[PDB]
Every structure is written in structure tokens, then in C-alpha cells.
Amino acid sequence: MVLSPYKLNLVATPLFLKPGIPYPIKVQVKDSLDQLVGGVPVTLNAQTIDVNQETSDLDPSKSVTRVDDGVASFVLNLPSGVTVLEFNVKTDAPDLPEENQAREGYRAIAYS
Amino acid sequence: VQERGHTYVTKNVTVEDGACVYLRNVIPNGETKALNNPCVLSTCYAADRKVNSTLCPNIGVDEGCHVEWTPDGVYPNCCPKHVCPS
């Protein structure tokens, strides 16, 4: 492997915050051969920025990629005045060191 | 010691006739009301012109699990449900 054996990609997760609707995040984990891999832990961290430039850190969430589609799912519930949601997903495979875990960051925006 | 329901504070809300007007939701002073939009549990403090709202808990889907959600109803019937067969 080089850097990491896993590649993270969002599926069915548009980076747009819709008001009054929960925000779902679905992450797929592939290998170097573009093959889905299940049973991989995925930890999600998030941070919200509102209209008053105030910052809120969420509690980390954990999911596992399924064996039928290699997808890990999260659902976040955000306050009403949130404009930006900066989140990141990282693998936590028990056979990989900390430095060799796949990590990816995304930024969802509210309408403007 | 995890926290499930997160709370936030909306400041500078409009106060009319002793009630908070929060996103077309009327909440009389010192009352706790379950809302549909947003799907939160709100409480008005008209003297400080603030509204304290509790959110639905965030869900991390486990193996063999899914999420059942509907926007209809007030809190907590509109919260996403972490449904795993049992």
C-alpha cells in the first residue's frame, strides 16, 4: 500500500444544508483496486459555524461499512442558524496504524 | 459520559404579547413546547429574549441497522430513529 490502502468517498451526500431537515452522511471505503470493503470502522467529527461566527463542536460519531455495500451512515441534527458544517471522516481499521488510516474532510454550506 | 440531546440557544428572538416568536413558533414565557419545524424542544425566556432548544440525538448507524425518519409530527416524533431489528 501507499499512504493508505483505503479511499473514502461520499455517496448520496450533497454538501448543502437544508433548513429543518436532518443532514445524512454516507461514506464508502474502497481499496486501491476500486473494490468496496466492509467491516471498516468510520469515525465522524463535525463543527458548525452559525450566522454570528460562533463555533460549535459535535460529539464524534461511529459507524461501520456494511458487508453488502461498504457504506457507513451518519445522521446529524443541526441548529437553526447554522451556515457552515465542516466535517471529516476517518477510518479506524484494527489492522492499520494511526498514520495509515484514510482521512477525508468536507464542507457543507447553507443557502446564501 | 456521552450527551445524546444537544442544546442550543437562539438569541435576540422577537417577543410579542409575552411570547417568543421563533421561526413562526409561538412559545409563551417560561413554557416548554415541542416543535415540528424545527424538530426541536424549545423553551422561551422573554425577559432575555432567548430560546433554549434541544435537538434530536445524532445517529451512528451500526451493523444491520438503518434510519427511519419522518418530518411529520412534533418533537420527538419527527426525530430520526436508529432502527435495528429486534
Residue numbers in the entry:
A (entry chain E): 347 to 458
B (entry chain F): 2 to 87
What does the paper say about this structure?
The 3 pathways all converge at the activating cleavage of C3 into C3a and C3b, and the subsequent activating cleavage of C5 into C5a and C5b. To address the need for a more detailed understanding of the mechanisms of C5 activation, we have identified and characterized a family of C5 inhibitors from tick saliva, hereafter named the CirpT (complement inhibitor from Rhipicephalus pulchellus of the terminal pathway) family. Analysis of the specific binding interactions between C5 and CirpT1 suggests that the CirpT family functions by direct steric blocking of the docking of C5 onto the C5-convertase, and our data thus provide support for previous models of C5 activation, which include convertase binding through C5 domains MG4, MG5, and MG7.
The structure of the C5_MG4–CirpT1 complex was solved by molecular replacement with the isolated C5_MG4 extracted from the C5–OmCI–RacI complex. The N terminus of CirpT1 extends further, however, and engages in a 4-stranded β-sheet. A detailed analysis of the binding interface was carried out using PDB-ePISA. The interface is predominantly hydrophobic in nature, with His7, Tyr23, and Asn59 on CirpT1 contributing sidechain hydrogen bonds (to Asp405, Ser426, and Asn423, respectively). This placement of CirpT1 in the context of intact C5 revealed additional contacts between CirpT1 and C5_MG5, including a hydrophobic cleft between C5_MG4 and C5_MG5 that Trp70 and Pro72 of CirpT1 pack into. Of note, the stretch of residues from Cys66-Glu69 in CirpT1 extend over an extension of the hydrophobic crevice between C5_MG4 and C5_MG5, but leaving a hydrophobic hole.
